[PDB]
Amino acid sequence: RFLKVKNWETDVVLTDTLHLKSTLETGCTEHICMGSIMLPVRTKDQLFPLAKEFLDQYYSSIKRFGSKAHMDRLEEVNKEIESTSTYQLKDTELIYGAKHAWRNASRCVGRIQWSKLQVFDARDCTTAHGMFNYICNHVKYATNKGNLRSAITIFPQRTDGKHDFRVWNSQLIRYAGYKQPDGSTLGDPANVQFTEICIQQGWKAPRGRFDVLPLLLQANGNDPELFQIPPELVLEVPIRHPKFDWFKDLGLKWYGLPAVSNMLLEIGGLEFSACPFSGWYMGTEIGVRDYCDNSRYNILEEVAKKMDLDMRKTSSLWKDQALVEINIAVLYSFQSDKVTIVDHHSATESFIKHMENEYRCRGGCPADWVWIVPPMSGSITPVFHQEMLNYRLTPSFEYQPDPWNTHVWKG
């Protein structure tokens, strides 16, 4: 069964066959669409089918399907599962798996880069101190003095679920948030709950508006431990505007390196619960969401006042006007400091090219329109007018519950 999608601005039509390789479920049915729902322990029973499918994929990609290298690997994995109840990926399989989990991330507009991913194998890690060292090296490598490089670091896979490696931070670099007695919030409101855990675990909080959070690292199911990232590794950019001199006086900065650390990487049935990865920012992540979301820094009002906008009625679009200037300042500041960043016009244009290329060479490109379209100026980007098919391929990145809600404390 072939499926077509249409770009309604160019009339280009594309044919998806790759959705036939879709295993997982979307959450949708014939009678309901959960397209906008934000979120819609494994035995030897189902593992070898999951492993064989991944290995079939792996050996297809290298043009050795059905070879003796392929059949022996299948046999090897079979005997390892039936006797050890799990198995270990070769280095080549891990690299392929990580790259394809990114390739398969239907919510990711940056997937034109998916094949230039630097994979750090940290499966020999055993302790939190060891995790910190692997994360420090990730951050240094990925940052590259502002010439950002995509990287993932993969910690040991889950076994019985009682010995998990987890990074308790949602991103490796994030600012603290502090609920004040008067109901206001100092710093990033997104991070208040994590900040409180850190403070309870012994972190001395500087209690400023842009304090880099410590790393809270869990090795082998042990209680997590605190580590401070060396500040010389945390590249930050002061935010100024090319024409508004008062903008620097808002005292804003952001960090250079977006590095998501709370997701789960699934490869051939194995679960890598700690797999922090990083690329580089699209400016609207900072300028639109991080600064202008009502539940975040919410500097829209203050930028609006300083611009002297008509703030009495919303139909003056003072919010829209302030949001554009903030986003201009974010891109100006990063480019002025030679830190890698991409505006939403460039990134969505690249995604369309990637997606057409993926339809031609792969037969499909799963894509989540709700997440691909940028949070500002949606329809003047080319993805807005693009029909998109969303379906789940493996290897994949998955959500997982926050570890402080599942963790058994040792004391």
Ligand X SMILES: C[C@H](O)[C@H](O)[C@H]1CNc2nc(N)[nH]c(=O)c2N1
Ligand Y SMILES: Nc1ccc2c(n1)CC(OCc1cccc(CNCc3ccccn3)c1)=CC2
Q: Give which of ligand HEM, Zn ion, ligand X, none residue 33 binds (C-beta under 5 to 8 Å, depending on kind).
A: Zn ion
> Do 374 and 381 form a contact (C-beta atoms < 8 A)?
yes
**Residues annotated in a binding site for L-arginine:** 171, 280-281, 285
Options 103, 111, 158, 174, the catalytic residue: 111
Q: Give which of ligand HEM, ligand Y, ligand X, none residue 385 binds (C-beta under 5 to 8 Å, depending on kind).
A: ligand X
Cα three-residue angle 322-340-120, rounded to 5 degrees: 130
CA 14 to chain centre: 27
Q: Give which of a copy of itself, ligand X, Zn ion, none residue 13 binds (C-beta under 5 to 8 Å, depending on kind).
A: none
Give catalytic status of residue 111 as yes or no.
yes
* Interface with ligand X (CB under 6 A), residue from 53, 223, 236, 387: 387
Taken in order 174, 146, 155, 105, is the CA torsion positive or negative? positive
Q: Is 210 in the site for a copy of itself (CB under 8 A)?
A: no
Question: Which residues, 35 to 64, sit near ligand Y by CB under 6 A?
Answer: 38-39
Nearer to ligand Y by C-beta: 59 or 281?
A: 281
Nearer to a copy of itself by C-beta: 83 or 294?
A: 294
> Do 2 and 9 form a contact (C-beta atoms < 8 A)?
no
Nearer to a copy of itself by C-beta: 130 or 375?
A: 375
Residues with Cβ within 8 Å of 120's Cβ and at least 6 positions away in sequence, in order, are: 134, 137, 138, 141, 151, 152, 153, 154
Options 280, 318, 325, 358, the catalytic residue: 280
- Token couple for 394: 């493996």
Q: For residue 259, what is the enclosing H or E element? A: strand 259-260
Q: Is 38 in the site for ligand X (CB under 6 A)?
A: yes
Between CA 211 and CA 209 the distance in angstroms is 6
Between CA 209 and CA 252 the distance in angstroms is 9
- Give the residue carrying structure tokens 């039936």: 82
Options 80, 285, 349, 398, the catalytic residue: 285
Residue 246, burial from CB neighbour count under 10 angstroms (0-12, 13-18, 19+): exposed
User: Looking at 276-284, 309-317, 348-356, 388-396, which segment touches ligand Y (CB under 6 A)?
Assistant: 276-284
**For ligand X, how many residues bind (rule: CB under 6 A)?**
9
Catalytically active residues are: 108, 111, 280, 285
Q: Where along the sequence are the contacts to ligand X (CB under 6 A)? A: 8, 36, 38, 370-371, 384-387
Binding site for ligand HEM (CB under 6 A): 102, 105, 107-110, 113, 117, 150, 152, 277, 279-280, 282, 285, 289, 342, 347, 371, 397
